[PDB]
Motif scaffolding. Structure first.
Motif, PDB file in Angstrom:
ATOM      1  N   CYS A  83      53.854  50.574  34.390  1.00 25.54           N
ATOM      2  CA  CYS A  83      52.667  50.065  33.725  1.00 25.54           C
ATOM      3  C   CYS A  83      52.501  48.564  33.884  1.00 25.54           C
ATOM      4  O   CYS A  83      51.585  47.993  33.283  1.00 25.54           O
ATOM      5  CB  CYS A  83      52.702  50.426  32.243  1.00 25.54           C
ATOM      6  SG  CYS A  83      54.091  49.720  31.344  1.00 25.54           S
ATOM      7  N   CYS A 121      58.777  46.527  33.761  1.00 25.75           N
ATOM      8  CA  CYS A 121      58.503  47.928  34.055  1.00 25.75           C
ATOM      9  C   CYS A 121      57.661  48.047  35.315  1.00 25.75           C
ATOM     10  O   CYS A 121      56.569  47.477  35.396  1.00 25.75           O
ATOM     11  CB  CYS A 121      57.788  48.583  32.877  1.00 25.75           C
ATOM     12  SG  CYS A 121      57.414  50.327  33.113  1.00 25.75           S
ATOM     13  N   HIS A 135      60.842  50.965  25.845  1.00 32.38           N
ATOM     14  CA  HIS A 135      59.492  50.951  26.385  1.00 32.38           C
ATOM     15  C   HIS A 135      59.230  52.140  27.301  1.00 32.38           C
ATOM     16  O   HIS A 135      58.214  52.823  27.152  1.00 32.38           O
ATOM     17  CB  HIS A 135      59.220  49.657  27.148  1.00 32.38           C
ATOM     18  CG  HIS A 135      57.844  49.600  27.730  1.00 32.38           C
ATOM     19  ND1 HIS A 135      56.722  49.381  26.963  1.00 32.38           N
ATOM     20  CD2 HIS A 135      57.407  49.763  29.001  1.00 32.38           C
ATOM     21  CE1 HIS A 135      55.652  49.396  27.737  1.00 32.38           C
ATOM     22  NE2 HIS A 135      56.041  49.625  28.979  1.00 32.38           N
ATOM     23  N   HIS A 188      56.702  56.324  28.372  1.00 31.86           N
ATOM     24  CA  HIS A 188      56.192  56.940  29.589  1.00 31.86           C
ATOM     25  C   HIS A 188      56.790  58.313  29.852  1.00 31.86           C
ATOM     26  O   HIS A 188      56.491  58.910  30.890  1.00 31.86           O
ATOM     27  CB  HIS A 188      56.467  56.048  30.800  1.00 31.86           C
ATOM     28  CG  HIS A 188      55.750  54.737  30.763  1.00 31.86           C
ATOM     29  ND1 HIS A 188      54.394  54.627  30.971  1.00 31.86           N
ATOM     30  CD2 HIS A 188      56.204  53.477  30.566  1.00 31.86           C
ATOM     31  CE1 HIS A 188      54.040  53.359  30.888  1.00 31.86           C
ATOM     32  NE2 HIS A 188      55.119  52.639  30.646  1.00 31.86           N
TER      33      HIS A 188
END
Ligand SMILES: [Zn+2]
Lengths: 49, 98, 128, 878, 49
Positions: D5, D2, D18, D22
């Motif tokens: 993050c 990612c 994941h 966000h």
């Protein structure tokens, strides 16, 4: 101070200057070594490419 | 308290003597929705049509859609809002200071 | 066409200086909520739950119990931070117990049978 | 991986799950560090196989639970079935034949009955239900299950507790409709009586059955009936959807407005539970402000997110809703040491695991290098490594009001001691350096009377009476009504009589550590449970300075080092000239003075630690605690404002009742007493050092992060609203059946009941407790410390008094809760539709009526009823 | 906790109610509190104990 905004929709990600500015990943920068040391893994995945 | 009320009908019936003992004092016949709804009318029996005051936003020609008459009679056909949210988890990137 | 972009490669170089496995095992027990205190309060039937005891004798008994719990949690035989036999004359200390009800009476007899006796004192049977 | 993050994701074809966290479209907390590869996540407590996870031990309540299906509680059931020969049987296609469906039961008599959520798809049900049989069967089960644990006839219901049953039934009825109406898919119609209206479709394989039940205008007018001349009266366009959002995610509209069957009562309840959960949301910008502020400037957090509108995360309540949860948690204790032992125990463990201070007792042995010199090595015992007393003494500063810390009687001299003995002098030295670290409001009076007890016979000081002699033990000066006049005014001690005692009283009055305060947490978004105390201060009995590690160990600006130096100088003056110690055959004055000079000039980084890094660690730890700190103000020596008594008030202010003091007022001290060990506190003060390589910006940035990774603040803030909200539904519902002076508006009085006493009200309040716990899925405490004696209460309050009788009342006002005024709204709905819940008003008339007239005895004609107005009617009473 | 004293309308006997009331009034005159016990034992100790 290090606040990094991610780049949504093709725009470049930015990092916060000492004087409140947001700059892209270009040009000439000046770091202290401890700033890299405290954030070494978060800076590796952002800057080394 | 045991009550004993008769049955509505759509055609005329034969009268018969029926003796009853326990009554009420005031109008407690509000829970009754309708009698013999398949029929055209009710000849004998306690007649009661469809309660039109509960279906207010249909049968009233000049009514706002999103209104209520709440403390008097509940309306059984209303305007409801439907949502679809998300609850993301607590994410944080923890950075160090020199 | 990703050829594993040069930002990341892990080897676990840095180890935690206070230690993640040492700090987290203490935060797991700082996370724990406060123990419930239930005695003195009624159940679904109406009886005040708890034991039948003088309230001050019970408040001394929990000082004994928490002193022994302290001695076991400090991994030793005698406690050092003791909660009983301190310097203070704490002789009016009261705790909640099942001895008194919510009204202010005693609980030598349960409420669910006090009310049963009070109603069963009045019956009326059929004539023969 | 990612690129937002900086999380490393194995098998890169599943990072959609994941990046959905966000806000980027296709469990509890997800924290990742920035200097090492160790991400830390959380998960709930009921799950199994916590591989790379940890629990959330607090009882978070299930606020947001969704609900598909139509939102009503009143359904229509048939009673007596019938069938008629109809004229129209099916519909006209080319070759098909569609059946005729009806929204209503087609029977001879149909009437409205009540079933909460009879058509609903729920992900987690509130285990509460008003399920009512149709009224030809029995219905007495709904008016017997409360306050009928004894009954002479199990097939009956008590006339004296109808109101206590109806209020609990209405509490159930509101309290199981706390859902959110969930969006679902639609479908377009081309039925000849519904043209193009995008009708709602339910989830499930048998989805298209529900259209007749939902939409009464879907069937036409095939024949002549009471349903058909009603469908012929209804309008046509008001069916299906009405409004949609402008924003979408691809194809789904965000929020919709649909015309369908429901009831006004449940949609009015859910439309304000909607606003209740919508008031509490918070963007991640305020979280990354909050944790940055709570980390005391050693750690900067950030939380990136995408622009979204429909995001919901209820985590914001007020100080007023926080303080009352604090008062309930204080009432939970009730003077037993069991519920406050593990709190202080694990905070003492956590301070040891975070703190840089390495306490080894070998510094004393290396300084002594061994008689008076070996006697203190006997008394201190540096072969021991048990230092729980010092960490508990530090952990007790956060709790001044519920617990207090004293020094055990084992640390005192034997029979008061005397200065002629060497062991009692070392006892005094061990005691006087450990006394300032305790939350005892009278530490200096004990510090004075220990030496005044040891100096009995060689010089005398005045006292107030004959009774309280100077030779009274220093254990028993425990409450400010015992502070002597000789200590209150220094000038009564003459230097001719008691020179060392006047020096000791002068040292106490000048160089004793004064209290101070420090800011923690954040009051803007998290709030603060600071009762008796301003919203961003943490009261400490020690002075604090900003942190640096290069300060010298032998500064006398540091008040603890100053205190150690002044005690050593006073003991040097005490030993110096061989009076006060007759019978010493050798001359021990040089050796005693040397072993005092070594203890004065010992190097120890504990007084450096306690004024620089200990309040920083306390301010970091304190807002993340499960029981946030409850403090009462520290005074140095001001006798006129010393707290003696802390109580909690159930009743209101304008009333006057029985004086019901809380149990916490019964302590001799201000809280529950605990005894520490002056030996261990003294040796931990005299020794202890830092690691020889620490940088604070490494050590604290590495000690804060796993601690905040196991945070539970967002669940405690989400539980305190429920704790605050149960109180209104207690005080409003108990005021209906009992008698109080608290005015709430008497929403039903025609239902008969009794003026309930405390036992009956407590039994009722227990059901009010357990229904809310059962529905919101909690296991721990909720509302039950109020159950123990006099539940007829009005308004939470808490007080404390000084010595001179000045009390401080703190009454937190409460904002209006939603369950309270929604129950008190549906009571006013019940006042007009009482018949639907199986209850009738008025009364009955028993008597023989024999006629062939049919008129349905739910509706009597006026020709055969009577009352008190009716002439010739006799009235019998009692 | 237990309440201190109550008054009930029960059946009784007004003679023995008076007897037990005067016996309670006799025993209530003999009453010392822990503060006066502390003062008496401290003054009796001659300040030693
Ligand atoms: Zn991510």
């Amino acid at each position: 101070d290090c606040r990094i905004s991610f780049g949504m929709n093709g725009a470049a990600p930015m990092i916060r200057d000492e004087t409140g500015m947001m700059v892209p990943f270009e040009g000439n920068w000046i770091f202290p070594l401890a700033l890299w040391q405290m954030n070494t893994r978060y800076f590796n995945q952002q800057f080394d490419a | 308290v045991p009550f004993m009320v008769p049955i509505s009908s759509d055609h005329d019936i034969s009268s018969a003597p029926a003796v009853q003992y326990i009554i009420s004092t005031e109008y407690n016949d509000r829970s009754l929705f309708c009698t013999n709804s398949s029929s055209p009318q009710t000849i004998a029996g306690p007649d009661k049509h469809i309660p039109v005051e509960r279906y207010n936003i249909l049968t009233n020609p000049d009514a706002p859609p999103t209104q209520i008459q709440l403390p008097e009679v509940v309306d059984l056909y209303n305007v409801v809002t439907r949502y679809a949210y998300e609850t993301p988890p607590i994410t944080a990137v923890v950075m160090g200071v020199p | 066409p990703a050829t594993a972009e040069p930002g990341t490669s892990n080897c676990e170089h840095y180890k935690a200086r206070p230690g993640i496995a040492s700090v987290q095992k203490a935060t797991e027990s700082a996370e724990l909520p406060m123990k419930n205190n239930d005695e003195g309060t009624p159940d679904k039937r109406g009886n005040t739950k708890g034991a039948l005891v003088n309230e001050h004798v019970e408040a001394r008994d929990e000082a004994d119990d928490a002193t022994k719990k302290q001695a076991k949690d400090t991994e030793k035989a005698k406690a050092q931070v003791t909660y009983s036999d301190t310097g203070i004359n704490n002789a009016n200390e009261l705790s909640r117990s099942g001895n008194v009800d919510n009204e202010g009476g005693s609980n030598q007899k349960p409420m669910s049978t006090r009310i049963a006796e009070a109603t069963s004192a009045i019956v009326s049977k059929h004539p023969a | 991986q990612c690129h937002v993050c900086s999380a490393v994701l194995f098998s890169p074809l599943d990072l959609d799950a994941h990046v959905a966290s966000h806000g980027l479209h296709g469990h509890i907390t997800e924290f990742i560090s920035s200097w090492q590869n160790h991400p830390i996540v959380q998960v709930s407590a009921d799950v199994e196989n916590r591989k790379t996870a940890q629990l959330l031990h607090a009882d978070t309540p299930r606020l947001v639970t969704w609900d598909a299906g139509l939102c009503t509680s009143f359904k229509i059931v048939p009673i007596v079935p019938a069938q008629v020969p109809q004229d129209v049987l099916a519909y006209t296609f080319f070759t098909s034949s569609y059946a005729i469906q009806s929204p209503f039961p087609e029977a001879a008599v149909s009437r409205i009955v009540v079933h909460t959520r009879w058509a609903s798809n729920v992900d987690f049900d509130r285990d509460s239900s008003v399920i009512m049989a149709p009224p030809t069967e029995n219905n007495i089960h709904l008016f017997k299950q409360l306050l009928n644990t004894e009954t002479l006839s199990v097939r009956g219901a008590n006339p004296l507790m109808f109101r206590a049953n109806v209020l609990h039934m209405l509490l159930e009825f509101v309290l199981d409709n706390l859902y959110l109406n969930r969006h679902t898919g639609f479908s377009q119609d081309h039925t000849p009586f519904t043209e193009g209206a995008n009708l709602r479709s339910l989830p499930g394989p048998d989805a298209e059955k529900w259209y007749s039940i939902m939409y009464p205008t879907r069937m036409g007018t095939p024949n002549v009936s009471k349903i058909c001349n009603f469908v012929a009266s209804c309008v046509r366009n008001r069916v299906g959807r009405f409004d949609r959002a402008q924003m979408m995610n691809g194809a789904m509209s965000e929020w919709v407005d649909v015309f369908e069957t429901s009831d006004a009562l449940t949609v009015s309840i859910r439309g304000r539970w909607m606003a209740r959960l919508a008031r509490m949301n918070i963007n991640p910008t305020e979280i990354e402000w909050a944790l940055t502020e709570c980390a005391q400037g050693y750690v900067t957090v950030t939380s990136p997110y995408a622009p979204s509108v429909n995001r919901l995360m209820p985590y914001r309540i007020s100080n007023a809703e926080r303080q009352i949860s604090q008062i309930i948690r204080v009432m939970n204790i009730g003077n037993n040491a069991t519920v406050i032992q593990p709190v202080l125990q694990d905070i003492s463990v956590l301070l040891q695991r975070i703190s840089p201070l390495q306490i080894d007792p070998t510094i004393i042995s290396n300084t002594m290098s061994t008689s008076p010199a070996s006697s203190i090595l006997g008394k201190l015992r540096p072969s021991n490594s048990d230092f729980s007393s010092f960490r508990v003494a530090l952990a007790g500063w956060l709790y001044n009001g519920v617990v207090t810390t004293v020094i055990d009687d084992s640390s005192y001299p034997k029979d008061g001691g005397s200065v002629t003995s060497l062991e009692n002098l070392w006892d005094f030295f061990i005691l006087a350096l450990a006394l300032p670290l305790t939350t005892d409001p009278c530490a200096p009076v004990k510090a004075f009377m220990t030496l005044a007890n040891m100096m009995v016979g060689f010089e005398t000081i005045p006292m107030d009476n004959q009774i309280y002699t100077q030779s009274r033990r220093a254990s028993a000066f425990s409450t400010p009504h015992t502070w002597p006049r000789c200590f209150m005014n220094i000038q009564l001690i003459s230097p001719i009589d008691a020179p060392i005692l006047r020096q000791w009283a002068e040292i106490i009055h000048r160089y004793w550590p004064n209290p101070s305060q420090i800011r923690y947490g954040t009051p803007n978004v998290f709030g603060s449970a600071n009762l008796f105390t301003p919203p961003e201060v943490l009261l400490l009995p020690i002075d604090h300075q900003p942190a640096n590690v290069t300060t010298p160990t032998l500064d006398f600006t540091n008040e603890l080092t100053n205190w150690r130096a002044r005690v050593c100088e006073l003991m040097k003056n005490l030993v110096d000239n061989q009076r006060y110690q007759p019978g010493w055959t050798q001359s021990l004055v040089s050796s005693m003075r040397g072993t005092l000079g070594k203890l004065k000039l010992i190097k120890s980084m504990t007084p450096m630690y306690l004024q620089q890094l200990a309040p920083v660690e306390l301010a970091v730890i304190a807002p993340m605690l499960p029981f946030p700190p409850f403090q009462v103000p520290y005074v140095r020596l001001d006798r006129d404002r010393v707290p003696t008594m802390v109580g909690v008030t159930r009743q209101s202010r304008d009333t006057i009742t029985q004086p019901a003091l809380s149990l916490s007022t019964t302590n001799t001290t201000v809280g529950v007493p605990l005894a520490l060990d002056a030996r261990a506190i003294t040796v931990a003060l005299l020794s202890g050092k830092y690691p020889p390589d620490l940088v604070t910006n490494v050590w604290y940035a590495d000690a804060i992060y796993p601690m905040y990774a196991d945070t539970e603040v967002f669940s405690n803030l989400q539980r305190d609203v429920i704790t605050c909200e149960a109180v209104q539904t207690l005080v409003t519902l108990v005021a209906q059946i009992s008698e109080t002076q608290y005015p709430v508006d008497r929403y039903l009085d025609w239902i008969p009941s009794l003026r309930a006493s405390a036992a009956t009200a407590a039994t009722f309040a227990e059901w009010v407790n357990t229904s809310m716990k059962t529905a919101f899925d909690l296991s721990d405490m909720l509302l039950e410390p109020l159950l123990s004696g006099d539940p007829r209460m009005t308004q939470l309050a808490i007080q404390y008094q000084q010595y001179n009788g000045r009390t401080f009342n703190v009454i937190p006002e409460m904002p209006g809760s939603v369950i309270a005024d929604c129950v008190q709204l549906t009571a006013e709905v019940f006042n007009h539709e009482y018949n639907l819940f199986g209850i009738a008003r008025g009364d009955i008339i028993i008597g023989r009526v024999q006629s062939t007239h049919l008129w349905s005895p739910l509706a009597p004609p006026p020709d055969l009823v009577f009352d008190r107005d009716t002439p010739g009617v006799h009235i019998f009473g009692r």
